[PDB]
Structures are given as C-alpha cells and as structure tokens.
Amino acid sequence: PRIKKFAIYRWDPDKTGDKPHMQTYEIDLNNCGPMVLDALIKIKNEIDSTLTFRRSCREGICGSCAMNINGGNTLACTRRIDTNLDKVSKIYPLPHMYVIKDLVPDLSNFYAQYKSIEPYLKKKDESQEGKQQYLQSIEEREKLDGLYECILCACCSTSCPSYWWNGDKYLGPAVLMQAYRWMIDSRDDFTEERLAKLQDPFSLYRCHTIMNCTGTCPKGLNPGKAIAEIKKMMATYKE
Template sequence: MAAARVLLRRGSAAARGLLPTHVPPATAAAPVAARLLQAQAHSSQPDSAAAKPKRTKTFSIYRWNPDQPEKPQLQNYEIDLGECGPMILDALLKIKNEIDPSLTFRRSCREGICGSCAMNIDGDNGLACLTKISAAAAATTITPLPHMYVVKDLVVDMTNFYSQYKSVEPWLKRKDPPPTPGKEIPQSKKDRAKLDGMYECILCACCSTSCPSYWWNPESYLGPAALLHANRWIQDSRDQYTKERLDAVNDEFKLYRCHTIKNCVHACPKGLNPAKQIESIKKLQLQ
C-alpha cells in the first residue's frame, strides 16, 4: 500500500518516468520466506531414528509340541522394547501376533485376577501380566511352571492341581438351615476379617509348583494352594464342618509334608502367605 501511494503521488519520480512504475507486492515474497523458515526449522530438528535407537532384547522361550518328535528346546526371539508394552505378557503377545503364531500359552484378564498366565520367568514363578520386562538383563528365559506335565509350550496340565483343590471341598457346608430362610447367613466384621489373606487366592499354582515338597509328593501332598483354601473354610464362622475338615487333612502326607520352606510365600503374586495358613491348621490339630 505504501508503494501504491508513492506511485500515485503527484510529481513523484515514478510518475515522471524516472523509476519503474511496477513494484512487486509485499505478499509475493511471503510464501518464499515461509518455506525458508520451515526448511531451517526442519534441518534443526534431530533425526528421530538416530535419537531413538532400537532397544533389542532376547526372549528365550521353552518350546515343545507333542505332535512333533523333537525334544523340548529354548527358542530365541528378538523384540524391540520400544515397540512393546512393559510386561512379559506384552512381549509374548507381540511374538505370537507378529513373529510366531504357533507359540502357545494361557492368558485372559491381563490384570492379575484370573491366574491363567502363570509361568516361570528367569527362575521365579509369577504371572506374565504382572511381571515387568527387565531392562537390565540381556535376555529373559521363560519356561512352564516347574514339575508339571507340559501340554504344549508354556501350557501345563492343571488336572491334579484342581483335583486337590476340589478334595478340600471349598464351599460352605451347613448342618443347620440358615437362621432366616432365603437370606444370607450373617457374619460379624471380626469373623469376616479372619478370611483376609486367604479368599484372595486366584489358583494360579505359582505357590504349589515352587514347593520342593510338592515336587517330591505331587500325588499325596495337597500343596500350599489347596491347604490355604482348606483353612479358609475352617476359619469361616458360617461353616459347621470344622472338625470334619480338620480330620480330612490330618494326614502324614496331605498336611505334614510341608516343611516350612516358604517358597510359596515368595512365589505368590497376590502377596499371600500360604505357609502361615498351613501352620494355623497344624496348630488346630493339637487342640
């Protein structure tokens, strides 16, 4: 606009033909300047690929297929941790979805509730959904729960474990009808508090499969998980079969194969103490 006013001014040099009458508008140079600024800004930014190198980690996973004659082996998989979630289960899902769909393992809730993804991770039993990927170690070894029959890869046969759980009759048993027909049986807060540390068990089998006594006597020793649930119903004030429950587990192998090694306490992903519950049953046997 200023240039236009100069041209229109009477007596100006441009009007007398001393200067060119065409002056480029200021907006003509704007796109060029903008492109130059964008190019400078882009050149000043670091290369994202160079700034974030791959964080590769090796996962050595137990593989065995009953339909093939090969012996069990550990198979290595390389994962970029920058493209993977923080948990072991995230790595397993990435391997199965993107690298090897034949990899077999159990999983469900991803929240530490169902207990399906129990396995041995770098020598410790735990839930894959709750175990973080270690950035310190170069490799992570994942195997099935120890001393269990393997169905395939990381899947173990839980038949015996569930049979032992069923044997303690983990349900409310009454000799008398409820005080009020059709209504729940009342329980005081104090009696309810006695069940804390037992009802939270998710039957993942991490505790039982970490116990040497269970390894040696898997058919006769009930194991930490089953005995914890036995005590859960022994301690329940609403149950009327306390004596019968105590008599059922008062056996040289069912109960007293526990030698208080306490591997079960370390292995429990819910922070429970099965050894304490087993000790409680032993004390009640003396009364």
C-alpha cells in the same frame, strides 16, 4: 530401537520325535507393553504364532498366564520386563509339571486336589438356606482377608519342593490355604471334619516349612503362614 532377547521353553506334541528345547526371540521394547505377557503376545502376533500359552484377564486376577519367569513363579501380565538389555529373559512352564505343549502345563491334578477339600460353605441344618442372610461380624470377616483373595494360579504349589517330589499325595500350599479359608470362616459348621480330612502323613504333613510358596505368590499372600496355622489347629482341636 531397543532390543531385548527372550529364551522360551518349546515343545510340540504333534511333531514326531521332538524333544524340549529353547527358542530365542528379539523384541523392540519401544513397540511393546511393559509386561512379559505383552512380549509373549507380541511374538505370537508378529514373530511366531506357534508359541502356545494360557492368557485371559491381562490384569492379574484370573491366573491363566502363571509361569516361571527368570527362575521365579509369577504371572506374566503383572511381571514387568527387565529393561536391562544385556540380560536375557528366560521363560519356562511351571516347574515339575507335565507339559501339554510349550508353556501350557496339565493342572487337572491341581484342580482335583482343590475339589477334595470341598471349597464351599457347609451348614449342619441346610433347610433354611436361600431366604435369610447369615450374620458375620466385621472381625469374623477380617479373618478371611489374606486368604480369600487366592487366584488358584498354582505358582506357590509349583514352587514347593515337597509338591515336586510328592504332588500326587500332598495337597500343596494353594489347596491347603483354601482348606484353612473355610476352617476359620465363622459361617462354616464343619471345622472339625475338615481338619480330620488331613489326618494322614501326606495331605498336610509333607509341608516342612520351606517357604517357597509365600516368596513366590504374585498376589502377596502367605500360604505357608496359613499351613502353620492349620498345623496348630490339628494339635489343639478336641473331640
């Protein structure tokens, strides 16, 4: 037998006058998968079926299980459990978010921000669409690498201290990188207008290069660098 302890943030909205608290669970690692989601599923299935969390793909491309593990925002299905038994895994919801229940945060604001940057291809003349494939060279396509792979797990934005204090008016890492994703896409014709949508003190300019976003992104992406690249476009674009 090989026991590992898990301290997990718990809050029930249906329980009268219940405040946020931590609960510990004991798990034999000889009977559990290597990843933290496996643990959460195991304690759900065997110990406590009250532990509520989001999950789906189990392979790290849906971004459902995004949560704070040991002080860092990642995906539970990709983070392997620290086989160090003397240490206790601390599991929290995504930082500075309204807790619906247990580890399930309200992401509807996050999604709404994504909606407001219009994350779809826009052409000046759209009467020809659907009958001929648009041409994009191998180099023009490479520009998208590192940007399109985004999962919208929200780890980065939820790690950004600017997004903590100003998440209402500041779009954050994830959404901003996606605005950049459409900016340098060669097929898009709304580069100038997309930039102008960020011409206020909050939308883009609440980034102060803290760089917590890049350091936490479970997919290895670099939103901070893209934000830096947006800022350079804002200062250089004409008309």
